[PDB]
Amino acid sequence: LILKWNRARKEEATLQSTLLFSAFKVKNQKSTRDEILRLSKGK
Amino acid sequence: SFNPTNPLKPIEEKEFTIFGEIVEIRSQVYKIRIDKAEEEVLPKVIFYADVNGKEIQLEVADIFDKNLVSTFVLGNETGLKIGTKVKSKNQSYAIKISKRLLGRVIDPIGKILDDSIATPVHGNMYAPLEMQHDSEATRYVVSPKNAILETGIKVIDVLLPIPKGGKTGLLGGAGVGKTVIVQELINAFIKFHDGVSVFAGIGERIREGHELWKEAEALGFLNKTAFIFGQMNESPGLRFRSGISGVKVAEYFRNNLGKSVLLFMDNIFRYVQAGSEISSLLEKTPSAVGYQPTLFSEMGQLQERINSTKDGDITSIQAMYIPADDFTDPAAVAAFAHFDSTIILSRQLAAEGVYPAIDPLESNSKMLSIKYTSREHLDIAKKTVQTLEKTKTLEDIINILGFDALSEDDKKVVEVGRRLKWFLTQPFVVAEKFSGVPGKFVRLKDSLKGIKTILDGDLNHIPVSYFSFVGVVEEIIEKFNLDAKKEALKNELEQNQK
Amino acid sequence: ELWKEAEALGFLNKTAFIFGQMNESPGLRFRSGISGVKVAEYFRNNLGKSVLLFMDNIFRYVQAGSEISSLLEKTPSAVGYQPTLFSEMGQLQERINS
Amino acid sequence: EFTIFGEIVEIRSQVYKIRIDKAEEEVLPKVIFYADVNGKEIQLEVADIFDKNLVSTFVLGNETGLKIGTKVKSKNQSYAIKISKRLLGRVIDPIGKI
Amino acid sequence: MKNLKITAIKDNLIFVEGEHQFSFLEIIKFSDKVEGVVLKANDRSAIVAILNEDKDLNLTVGSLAEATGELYKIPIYDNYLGSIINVLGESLVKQYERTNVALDKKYVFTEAQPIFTRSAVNEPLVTGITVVDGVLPVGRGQKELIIGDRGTGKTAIALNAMLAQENTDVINIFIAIGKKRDEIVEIYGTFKKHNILHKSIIVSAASDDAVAARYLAPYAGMAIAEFFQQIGKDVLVVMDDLTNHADAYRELSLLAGIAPAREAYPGDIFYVHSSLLERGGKYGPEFGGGSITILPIAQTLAGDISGYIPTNLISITDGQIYTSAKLFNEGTRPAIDVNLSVSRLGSAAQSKFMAFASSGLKKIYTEYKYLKRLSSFSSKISNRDLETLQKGKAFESLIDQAEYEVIDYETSAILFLLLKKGFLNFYTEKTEALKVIIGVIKVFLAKDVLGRKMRAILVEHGIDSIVWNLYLNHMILPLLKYHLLSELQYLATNREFIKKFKDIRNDGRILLAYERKGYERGIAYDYK
Amino acid sequence: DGVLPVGRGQKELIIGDRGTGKTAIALNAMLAQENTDVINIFIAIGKKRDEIVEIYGTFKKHNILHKSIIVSAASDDAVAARYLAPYAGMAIAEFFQQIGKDVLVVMDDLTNHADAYRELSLLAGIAPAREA
Amino acid sequence: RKLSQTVKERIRPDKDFVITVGTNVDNIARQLNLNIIDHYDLDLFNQI
Ligand SMILES: Nc1ncnc2c1ncn2[C@@H]1O[C@H](COP(=O)(O)OP(=O)(O)OP(=O)(O)O)[C@@H](O)[C@H]1O
Numbered sequence A: 001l002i003l004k005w006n007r008a009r010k011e012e013a014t015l016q017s018t019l020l021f022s023a024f025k026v027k028n029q030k031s032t033r034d035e036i037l038r039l040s041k042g043k
Numbered sequence B: 001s002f003n004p005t006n007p008l009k010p011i012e013e014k015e016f017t018i019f020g021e022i023v024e025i026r027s028q029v030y031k032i033r034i035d036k037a038e039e040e041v042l043p044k045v046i047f048y049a050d051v052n053g054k055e056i057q058l059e060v061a062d063i064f065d066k067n068l069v070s071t072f073v074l075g076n077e078t079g080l081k082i083g084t085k086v087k088s089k090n091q092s093y094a095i096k097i098s099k100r101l102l103g104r105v106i107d108p109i110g111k112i113l114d115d116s117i118a119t120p121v122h123g124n125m126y127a128p129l130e131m132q133h134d135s136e137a138t139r140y141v142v143s144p145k146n147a148i149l150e151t152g153i154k155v156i157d158v159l160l161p162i163p164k165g166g167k168t169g170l171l172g173g174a175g176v177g178k179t180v181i182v183q184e185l186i187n188a189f190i191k192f193h194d195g196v197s198v199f200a201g202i203g204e205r206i207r208e209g210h211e212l213w214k215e216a217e218a219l220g221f222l223n224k225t226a227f228i229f230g231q232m233n234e235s236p237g238l239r240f241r242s243g244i245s246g247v248k249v250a251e252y253f254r255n256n257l258g259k260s261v262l263l264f265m266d267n268i269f270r271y272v273q274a275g276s277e278i279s280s281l282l283e284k285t286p287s288a289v290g291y292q293p294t295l296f297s298e299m300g301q302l303q304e305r306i307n308s309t310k311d312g313d314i315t316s317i318q319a320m321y322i323p324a325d326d327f328t329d330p331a332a333v334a335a336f337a338h339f340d341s342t343i344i345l346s347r348q349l350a351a352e353g354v355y356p357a358i359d360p361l362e363s364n365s366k367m368l369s370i371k372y373t374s375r376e377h378l379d380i381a382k383k384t385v386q387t388l389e390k391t392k393t394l395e396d397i398i399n400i401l402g403f404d405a406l407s408e409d410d411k412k413v414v415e416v417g418r419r420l421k422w423f424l425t426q427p428f429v430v431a432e433k434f435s436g437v438p439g440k441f442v443r444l445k446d447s448l449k450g451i452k453t454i455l456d457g458d459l460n461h462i463p464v465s466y467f468s469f470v471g472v473v474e475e476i477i478e479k480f481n482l483d484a485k486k487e488a489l490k491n492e493l494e495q496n497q498k
Numbered sequence C: 001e002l003w004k005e006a007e008a009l010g011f012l013n014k015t016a017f018i019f020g021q022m023n024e025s026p027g028l029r030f031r032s033g034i035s036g037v038k039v040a041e042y043f044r045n046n047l048g049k050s051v052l053l054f055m056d057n058i059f060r061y062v063q064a065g066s067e068i069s070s071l072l073e074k075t076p077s078a079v080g081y082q083p084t085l086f087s088e089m090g091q092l093q094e095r096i097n098s
Numbered sequence D: 001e002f003t004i005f006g007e008i009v010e011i012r013s014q015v016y017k018i019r020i021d022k023a024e025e026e027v028l029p030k031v032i033f034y035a036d037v038n039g040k041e042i043q044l045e046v047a048d049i050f051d052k053n054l055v056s057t058f059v060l061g062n063e064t065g066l067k068i069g070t071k072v073k074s075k076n077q078s079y080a081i082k083i084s085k086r087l088l089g090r091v092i093d094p095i096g097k098i
Numbered sequence E: 001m002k003n004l005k006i007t008a009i010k011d012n013l014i015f016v017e018g019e020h021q022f023s024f025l026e027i028i029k030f031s032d033k034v035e036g037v038v039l040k041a042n043d044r045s046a047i048v049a050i051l052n053e054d055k056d057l058n059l060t061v062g063s064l065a066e067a068t069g070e071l072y073k074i075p076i077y078d079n080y081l082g083s084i085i086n087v088l089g090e091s092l093v094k095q096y097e098r099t100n101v102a103l104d105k106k107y108v109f110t111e112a113q114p115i116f117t118r119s120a121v122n123e124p125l126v127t128g129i130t131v132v133d134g135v136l137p138v139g140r141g142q143k144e145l146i147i148g149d150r151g152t153g154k155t156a157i158a159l160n161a162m163l164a165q166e167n168t169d170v171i172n173i174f175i176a177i178g179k180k181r182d183e184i185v186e187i188y189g190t191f192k193k194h195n196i197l198h199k200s201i202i203v204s205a206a207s208d209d210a211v212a213a214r215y216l217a218p219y220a221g222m223a224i225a226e227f228f229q230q231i232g233k234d235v236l237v238v239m240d241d242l243t244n245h246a247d248a249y250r251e252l253s254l255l256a257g258i259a260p261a262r263e264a265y266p267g268d269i270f271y272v273h274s275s276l277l278e279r280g281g282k283y284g285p286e287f288g289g290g291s292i293t294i295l296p297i298a299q300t301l302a303g304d305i306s307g308y309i310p311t312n313l314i315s316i317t318d319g320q321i322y323t324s325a326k327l328f329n330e331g332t333r334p335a336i337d338v339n340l341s342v343s344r345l346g347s348a349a350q351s352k353f354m355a356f357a358s359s360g361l362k363k364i365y366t367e368y369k370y371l372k373r374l375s376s377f378s379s380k381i382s383n384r385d386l387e388t389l390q391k392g393k394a395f396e397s398l399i400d401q402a403e404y405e406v407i408d409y410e411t412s413a414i415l416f417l418l419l420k421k422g423f424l425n426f427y428t429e430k431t432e433a434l435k436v437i438i439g440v441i442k443v444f445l446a447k448d449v450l451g452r453k454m455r456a457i458l459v460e461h462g463i464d465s466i467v468w469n470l471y472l473n474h475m476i477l478p479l480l481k482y483h484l485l486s487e488l489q490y491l492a493t494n495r496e497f498i499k500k501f502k503d504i505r506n507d508g509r510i511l512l513a514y515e516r517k518g519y520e521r522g523i524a525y526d527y528k
Numbered sequence F: 001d002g003v004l005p006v007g008r009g010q011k012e013l014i015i016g017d018r019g020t021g022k023t024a025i026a027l028n029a030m031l032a033q034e035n036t037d038v039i040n041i042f043i044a045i046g047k048k049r050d051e052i053v054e055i056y057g058t059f060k061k062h063n064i065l066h067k068s069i070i071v072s073a074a075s076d077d078a079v080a081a082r083y084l085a086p087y088a089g090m091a092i093a094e095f096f097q098q099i100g101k102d103v104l105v106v107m108d109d110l111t112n113h114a115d116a117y118r119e120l121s122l123l124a125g126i127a128p129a130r131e132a
Numbered sequence G: 001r002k003l004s005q006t007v008k009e010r011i012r013p014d015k016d017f018v019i020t021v022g023t024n025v026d027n028i029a030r031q032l033n034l035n036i037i038d039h040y041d042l043d044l045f046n047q048i
C-alpha cells in the first residue's frame, strides 16, 4: 500500500506542476519571438 | 384545448448581412476576417460556407476586433481552406421542430439520419441556444416534486427511488452497465407514459444508437419518441450541442403542446468533454486536471433548463461517465450537484457477477423522505443500508482474522447481509441476449415484503446461492423446496434399492 | 574497478570500452549508447566478427535524454519525461539486429 | 573543409545559441560546431534551427571557456569518432577522448 | 512548381513560407518521394509534420517545396496483398510486382458512414480459439479489444484469429505502430508459411519512424480496409497497438505546444481513438455490403485495467479480452481471464448450435470464482454448489491450446456441448486425463472421416436431430465412458455415472488405436 | 445545542460529503428561530432553482417567512453574480445589524463561490496557483 | 491426501469396517469402496 500511494502521489504532483507552468510559458511567447528576431538580425 | 403561457417563438426571417473569409486554419478551429457587414457581429452566431454544394457551419466563440472572429465547426470540416467565403445572418444555429419530429432520427444540427433519401422534417426554425422568457422571475415558477416513478428494479425501487419531474443520474466507469440500465428504464417507462419521449445520444456508440432505433421500431414506441444523435464519431462542435438540441425539443413538446416529456441523455459526460476540447483548441488557460474554466457554468446552462412547470413535467434520466474510475473528477463533481437521485455503479460488484452493479453504500436519493414515501419504506431502506454497511465492515474481519473470531450476532449479521446483497440482483428484460434468463418485473410492495422477510432471518437456512437473480422471494422458496424434494426422492429411491 | 578487472582477468585485449559516466554532461551520457552501437556495427560489418554489446546503465540513457529535453525548454510528459521517450529508445535499440 | 562560421550570441548552462555569419551551405540538423578555446576544442550539437542564421546547440562535453563572442565553425556534419581494430583494449568516451 | 520555402526546423516540425490556400492534412511535396502534412496554417505560412525521410535530400532551411493543393489520400495498388507497406504506399517487402496504375485513392480521415448505413451483427468470425469462439464470441463487424499486461500473449491471439481465416473469404490487415522490425518480418514469415499471405497486408510504422507516420498509420490502414469493404468483402483489421498510437499522438501534441491533461495525454485523445475506431462495422448492401472487424491491442501496467487509455478504449469497443500475467506465469496458454472478459454481442454473434452448446457457461464460471473466493462457516456444500464447482473446474481445462493452433468451430461447439451436458465433471480429480481425452477427441474430429461427417451433420441438421444424437451416442460417448472407467475404476458404481452412461457401450478402441499409431514410431533403446 | 454549542456572533462551518445533511442542519438552525428575534438570510451560490423554491416553501410552512430573505444566484447565472452574492447578503445582514438586530446567515455553499472566483480569475488572465 | 494414502495402505474392504464423519473422508471411503457402517456430521465432534 505504501508503494502504490507513493507512486500515485508522485505522478499527480508532477502533472499538476507541469500544467500550472503551462500558462506561464504560454503567456511569454511574444518576448521569446522578439528576442529570436533581434538575435537573428544581430550584427 | 391547451393554451400555452410561455410558448417557443420561431426565429426571425433575415438576410445574410455579414461576409468574410477564413484567414487562419487548424483542426476544428478556424479564424474568419469580416470584409463586409451592415451590422456588428454577435457572440455564438453561425457563419455558413459551401464547398461543392455541401454546407458547413461555424459557431463564433471569440470576437478579437471589429472584423476578426474565431469559430469552431459544427460537423465535418473537410473542404475548408484559406480564403473560403463565409456569410452570416448574425443568428445562432436553428433546427426544424414540430410534432413531425416524433419517430425521426436526426443529429444536433438537423441532418436526417434514418434514410438515405433524406426525407425532410416539416416544422418551424427554432434556435436551441436562444432561450426566451418574460423575465428572470418567470424562471422561478416551477412545480415541486410530488411523485415517484416505479421501475420494477428492486434496488432502485427500494433504496434509490427515482423522481417524477426530477433528475436521476447513473454514474460508473467503462463497461459497468450504464447503457443496459438506461435501456431497461426506457423499456419500463415508455408505452405507459402520458406524453412523449426524447432521447439524446451524446458521444456514444453508433451500434448502440442503431440497436435502440431498431428496438423502438420493433416494440412500437418509435412514433412516440424523438431521437437526436451526436455520437462519438462526430466533431467536438457537434457533441457539444446534442444536449442543447434535445433540451430544446423537450421544451417545445412541453411549452407548446402541454405534454410530459421523458428525457433520456447518454452520455452526459461527453458534452463536458467536447466543451473541454473546444476550450483547449481555442488556447484558453486550463483549470485543474486540464478542464475548461467554465465547466460548472457549462453544466448549469444545460441542466437548469430541465425543469417542471404547470404545463407538464420533464423527467430526465442521464448516464454519466467516470474517466479512469476516478469519482473525484471535476466533471463528476460538477454533475453531482444536479441529480435528485444518484446511482453509482461499481466495477468490483460487476466483476463478482452482481447485476445491476449498483453500490448502495455510495449512492443516495433525496426521494427517501416522508414527503414522498411511507414510514415503512423509509424504515426498510434504512435497515437494509445499515445491514449492508455492517456486513461490509465484518467481511474484512472475516477475511483477515478468519471466521471463528466472530460472535453469534456477527455471524447472523453476515448471513443476512449476504442474502440481502444477492437478493437485490435481478435479470433485466433487455439483458436476455447476454444470458437468456427471462426478465422479471417486481413491484414495490413485493420488494419490501421480500426484504423484510430476509431481514427478519426467516430464510437463513436457504443457501445464499439460491438468492441470486430471481424475482420475488417465492421463487427462492419454490426452488429450495423442489431441490429438497428431489434430494429426498433420490434418497428414498436409493434406500429402497440399497 | 571494471577496467582493472578486465585487464587482470585477461579479456581486455578483446573488449572496447566507451565510458560516459555520471560525472559527464548529459550530451555524453546520451551519446554513449549510440557510439557503442556504431563501434559494434563496425566490428560486425568491417571485421566480420560476432559482437556482444553490453550496456550499463540503460536507464541513464533515458534520464540523459529527459535532461536534455528539459534543458531545451520542451513540455514534459508522464513523470517529467521527454515526449520523445519511446522514439529515442527505438532509435537506440533498433540497430542491434541480426 | 570548414564551411560554416559564426559566433555565440547566447549562453546558459549546457545550452548555447550560435549566430551564423558566413556559410556556403545551409545548416543541417544535428551537425557539430567546433569552438577552439585555450588550445582545446569543444563540440556543440545543433538542436533547433530558428532561422537561416540563428541556431541552438547543447554542449557535448565540458563547457568551461565558452562565452559570448566565441568563434565557431562547422563542416555541416554530425559528430564522428575513430574506429578500427586498435580500439580493442582502449578506454574512450563517446566523442573519442582518451 | 515550387511555391514554398522552409524558414525554420524546430521540434521535428517544418515551417514553410509562401502565399497559398492551405488545408488541414494538405500534402506538401519536398521532392518526388518525401512528403509532409499541413497541421496549422496562416495565409502565408504553414507548419508541417514530415511523413518520410530520404538520405540524399538534405532537407534544411531554404529548401523548396510545393503545396500540391490536395488532401492526404493513400493510393491502392494490386500488389498490396502479401506485402509490407509504409503509410505512403511503398513496398518495404513485396511478393509480386506492382503495376503503376492506382485502383483507387482513399482519404485518410474519411468520416464514418451514418447510422442508416449499418446492419446488425449476425455472422461469426472464427478466431480458432475454443474459449473465444464459445464464450466470448466475435462477430463480423464487431470491435473486440485485446487488453493485457506485458508479454501475456495478445499478439499471439490476434495472429491466431487471422490464421484461422486460411479457408475463408476474409481479408486480413495488420497495422503495426511502433513495433520491432525483426518481429514484423517474423509475422510476415508466419503469414507466408500458413498460406494466408495472398490475402494479407501489413502496414508498418517503426518505433523510430516519423511521429506523423506513427500517428496516421491506423487511419491509412482503415482507408485500405474501407476500399476493400466498398466492393463487399469482409475485412479483419488488427491494430498493434493503440498504446503506441496514443504515445505518438501525445508526443506530437506536446511538441506542437498543446497543453497536457490527465496522464499528460492531450484532451482529445478519446476523440482520436473513437473517430478512428468508429469506421469499422457491418454495412448494408446499398453502401458496400461488407464488414470491417477490428481487434485493437492495448497494454496495462501491473494489471491495472482502470488506466486512462484502457478505459477510454473499453468505452469504444464492443467488449474486451483480458490476458492475465498471473495465469501466464503458471504456464496456462492462452492466459485469458474469462471472468474479466466479455463480449457484448453475445449469442447473437454465434451459430445456433454454438449458441445452444454454451448457453450459460460464462455465468457458471463467474459463480464458480465467486464460490471459490468465498469463506463460510458451514463446511457443508450443497449439491448445486458442488455442481457449479465441478463444472467450473471442468471448464478451466478447455482453455488450454497450443500456439498457432486453429481449432474448428464445430470442434469447439462439440466440446462445449460435452461440457454443458455434464460428461466432463467426473474428471474433477484427474486433469491430465481430461487433457488427454480432449486431445483424442480433437484428433478424431479433425482427421477421421467420421469426425468430419459428424461436424458436417452438426452444421446442416443441428444438435436436436436424431442423426447427430446417434453419432454422439455411438462415437464420442463410448470413448469417454471407457476412459473414465480406465482412469477411475470406482466410477463403475457411482450413481450419476450409472444414470448418464446407462445405454452407452464401453468401447474404447479409438483411443487405443491412436495410442498404437503414436507409439508405432517407438524404439526400445534411445540414442541420445 | 449540547455538545457542539453555537453562540450568537460565532461563525461555524458545516463541512461534509454530498448527501449527508448539511443543508438540512442549516435549515433546522433557521427554523429554530421561529419564536425568537433573529433574522434569517439564506444565500444560495450555484444552487438549483427547484431546491430554492422548495426551501422557500419550507420557510412559508413553518411561519418563519415574514423575517427571512433569500439571495439567489442559480447554477446558470452570470459568474460575477455568483461571486458577489455572499457579499450582498452580508451587506443586507450588516444593514439589519446596524439597528441592533441579531442576524443568522447561511452560505450554501462557499465551494461554489470559490469555483466562480477561480473561473473569473482564469478568464481574466490571472496566473494560476495551487489547484488553479 | 496423506490420510488417503494411509487408509489405502492399512485398511482392507473385507476384514475392516470404516466409520466416516465429514464429507471428505466419506468420499474417500466411497471411492475406496470400504465397508461404511454409518456416517455422521462433523458438528458432532464439536461436543465430546
Ligand atoms: N498459446 C500459446 N502457447 C504457447 N506459447 C505462447 C502462446 N501464445 C503466446 N505464446 C508465447 O508467449 C510469448 C509472449 O507472447 P506475445 O509475444 O504474443 O505477447 P504480447 O502481449 O504481444 O507481448 P509483448 O508485450 O512483448 O508485445 C511469446 O514467446 C509467444 O510465442
Ligand SMILES: Nc1ncnc2c1ncn2[C@@H]1O[C@H](COP(=O)(O)OP(=O)(O)OP(=O)(O)O)[C@@H](O)[C@H]1O
Binding pocket: B172, B173, B174, B175, B176, B177, B178, B179, B180, B181, B355, B356, B428, B431, B434, E314, E315, E316, E342, E343, E344, E345
Ligand atoms: N443487467 C445486466 N445483466 C447482464 N449483463 C449485464 C448487465 N448490465 C451490464 N451487463 C454486462 O456489461 C456489459 C456492458 O454493459 P453496458 O453496455 O451497459 O456498459 P456501459 O457502462 O454503458 O459501458 P461504456 O462505458 O462502454 O459505455 C454488457 O455487454 C453485459 O455483458
Ligand SMILES: Nc1ncnc2c1ncn2[C@@H]1O[C@H](COP(=O)(O)OP(=O)(O)OP(=O)(O)O)[C@@H](O)[C@H]1O
Binding pocket: B365, B366, B367, B368, B369, F017, F018, F019, F020, F021, F022, F023, F024, F025
Ligand atoms: N434529520 C434527518 N432525518 C432524516 N433524513 C434527513 C435528515 N436530514 C437530512 N435528511 C435527508 O438527507 C438527504 C440530504 O439532505 P440535504 O439536502 O440536507 O443534503 P446535503 O448534504 O445538503 O446534500 P447535497 O450535496 O446534495 O447538497 C435528504 O434526502 C434529506 O431528506
Ligand SMILES: [Mg+2]
Binding pocket: B178, B179
Ligand atoms: Mg454506455
Ligand SMILES: [Mg+2]
Binding pocket: E154, E155
Ligand atoms: Mg506484441
Ligand SMILES: [Mg+2]
Binding pocket: F022, F023, F108
Ligand atoms: Mg445541499
